[PDB]
Amino acid sequence: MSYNYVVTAQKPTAVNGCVTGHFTSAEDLNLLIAKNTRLEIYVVTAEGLRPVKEVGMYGKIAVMELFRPKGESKDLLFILTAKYNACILEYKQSGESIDIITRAHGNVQDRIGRPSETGIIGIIDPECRMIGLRLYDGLFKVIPLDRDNKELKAFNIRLEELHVIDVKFLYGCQAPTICFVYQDPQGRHVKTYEVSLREKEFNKGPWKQENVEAEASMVIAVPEPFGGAIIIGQESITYHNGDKYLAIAPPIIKQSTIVCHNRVDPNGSRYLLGDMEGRLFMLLLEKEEQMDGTVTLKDLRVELLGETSIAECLTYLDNGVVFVGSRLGDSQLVKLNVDSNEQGSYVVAMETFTNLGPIVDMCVVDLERQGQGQLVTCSGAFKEGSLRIIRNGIGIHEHASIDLPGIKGLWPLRSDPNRETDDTLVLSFVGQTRVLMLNGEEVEETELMGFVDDQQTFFCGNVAHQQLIQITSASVRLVSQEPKALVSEWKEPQAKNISVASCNSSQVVVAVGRALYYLQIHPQELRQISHTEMEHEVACLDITPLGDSNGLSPLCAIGLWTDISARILKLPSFELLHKEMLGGEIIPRSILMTTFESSHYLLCALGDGALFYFGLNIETGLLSDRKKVTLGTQPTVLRTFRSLSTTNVFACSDRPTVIYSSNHKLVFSNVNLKEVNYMCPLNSDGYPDSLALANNSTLTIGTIDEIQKLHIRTVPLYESPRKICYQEVSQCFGVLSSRIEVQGTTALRPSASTQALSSSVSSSKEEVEVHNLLIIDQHTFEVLHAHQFLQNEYALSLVSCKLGKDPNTYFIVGTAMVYPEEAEPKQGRIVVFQYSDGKLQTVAEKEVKGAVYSMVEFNGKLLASINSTVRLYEWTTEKELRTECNHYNNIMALYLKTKGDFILVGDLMRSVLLLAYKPMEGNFEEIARDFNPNWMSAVEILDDDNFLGAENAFNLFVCQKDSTDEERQHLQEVGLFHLGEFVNVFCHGSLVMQTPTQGSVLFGTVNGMIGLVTSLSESWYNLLLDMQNRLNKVIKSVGKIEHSFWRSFHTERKTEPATGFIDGDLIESFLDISRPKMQEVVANLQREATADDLIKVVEELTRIH
């Protein structure tokens, strides 16, 4: 009935978990990071983190632990998903190919069972005897680790303690033993049990229970030789080992709850601890010797090390390097020093990794140019709060601009053999060459002895033996560096024109029609080595040396006319090693051998904007795994360049692109420039690490931004942003923010709301939240003004609009007065503000008897939701809000969107409702509601007949009118899809410059994932649904989870297959399967579709984000 397509624009960035161990090999130290559905694998080096493999799971990662059974040469990986898919995984690398093998899998959900409120805990016995899971209160699930248990069959043990806080397996025990903290009416306690595989039951544990602190929250299992357990609370740290009990109460930890730990030393002598304010501590266990050679714990000390991002997880990585995994801010690599700095910190940040999450609100604005949307998010929380400005494509920073038309090629060179930097740029034109010298920033015409100016140059550069080369249509010219003189000249035997040229430091291959000549560069000598006659006219050549080659290529890559082939030839014989026919009647224009992330590729661009690429074996010359993308509609010219110590390929066309590698796959990112015809890298005194760019009329010099799909600007607020709106007439944003103060109440640090240029305060008629409206400049993101709300006043909703016949644009804020014992608020305000002359003036107020959860401008009026009421206000001539009409049939109306006279209302627990304003009756009519209960997080109107909801269990659904009257009032859920993210905000718009899809809705999530929803025809839906089913038969999923299971709508009330939703991430993955697989997919598929049809289809779909 409705057909929707959902695709990832930005993968989740929040770190949900981290572990270290030896997974990729026994001798590698690995960091594994869980980002919701993604697992990232790194090798830890001196240099830092090298990425080796990133995979997606068809599940949310809830447990991630490395372990090593006897007989295994390296660690295996246990994963449990939030839908209770369990697997054991093994890393396998066969040559260049890397695969995650599933050693065991099965689903471990029970039939009855309310998910424990305090979440899934999974733990692994140190001796790998069993995996233990706390999934539900009152039960402990055991998976025995026998070699025969490939289905991960489990049994449940009754657990008398219903409210477990945390649990670990202990070290040094003859039977598998758990230690856990639990809560009962008498307080919190620590207890142990042995786990008997024979009896499938608990036995008495080795040490008796103790009462612990009221807020004891984490258990640490300390390795031998200590053994035992550390229990971390809010004001105490205790150690237990039976006839051993030791407790400290250090004041230094009392300010903020400690929420994560990591073992620094294998023997447990030191642990890192992180708290909710980003403090990093070291916990030190002091040893005492004993006559019998055991070691017991003498004392415990805690030392403040410094400050990090607020850590969800910590991993020590050796040599003082710590990974800080953050959910609420950026993740980091930090270094711990033995000696402190000026301010007394041992912590120095080394590297920052972007986290957009949580995205709590966002808007789309054309900040810089018309038609180019940028997303501005409210990101992070507490000291990590920020605005983030997100935009597609890679920028260039122009540093020079010369009027100079007709350029046909650019080459840099070093005219001085004693200087490392380029000082010369050679330009070709039709039939001519010009040399430009660079003196700092000055760029000046000149001659260069040895080079000719009256022929077109096809290549020039530095070559071996301190020489320069120029290849023109007439000859190859070899020039000495000191002095500049012609030392050798090569011409074809009858002096026919050269038509194509390739060159490296010591080798030359030139074409003359169908003839090829191979030359070597020697001292004062161009030596002709060999020649051949190709079957067809030569279109393009490359001899870029790859790998451990010593600057020499044994291969020549060639593109031919007529048969449209890309071929690899051996030098010097010119023997054919491999031929690929590219199809069509349009010749290759650019061919390049290149390396990315240590793998070799052949790139071949046609004159129609097609780019083919292949794996290249530089030993055998074999091309494999052909792929194709379209980079424009014009001939593309390819050229290698380096930035940030990485070689990439710049593709010149009508749509300039950078080609690079990410997770050992080629990626393509737009450069934000108009048409570029030619380019070369340029690294001169005045223009270090730059690019020279030419179009039809202009030569530019500039630097390039980071090579990535999306560019992100961060604006730190040092406090929690809550909502955002743009006010075009003021050229600024309004942002609701809150900061924590401690009760007179005192602030913890300066932040946006206490550092505005000017400030104002409302006048009345982790201790406390103080709320503010910030006014922020759209260009500088400076905080121009901050208005502080009343004590106990929480700002919930924000809109920028005009009302009635009043020409002013206002910022309007809806609030709640929050008191401790109230089930919900019974008081709040709507406040209308005018931003004028650097400050917010209060124009009007309205007291209401509830929380103002949501507001929208509606046909020149103000729509607001207040507790269980939706209300429409008019703006009177006396500049006051006056109630027009009310709707009462809600539990708690949290979310509003409107289109025309229609209003979509999202409820706390009864899903969505459609209202209409009746302009000829001045009131609301309830049109229809979704009678299925759903706990809503966000809503959006897709169009007049289709309503999108997100709910708290990470599902999307789509409702439509069912086209009796009682019947017309029943909205139908026609689309269902498990997304696996928590949606905070939907907003209409696109990051692409303004096909199979209609409409564009972006969403922002808690994990900092950004998605897109668009609409499909029935026809397109049917084709893509068929593709999915076929893809699902050929793709091997990690952990052998079925895609259909993953995407099934799932709440406590209802599990059903997905319907009316295409998984764009799955569809896009078609462009990464093998050619056989594509054939399997494309067989007997409705017109009988071919692989190459689908490739093109999936490209039109990738361009929507």
Ligand SMILES: Nc1cccc(-c2nc3ncccc3o2)c1
């Ligand atoms: N050297 C290198 C290259 C590319 C990506 C990364 C990286 N991205 C991360 N995101 C979160 C946490 C840790 C991370 O490390 C690191």
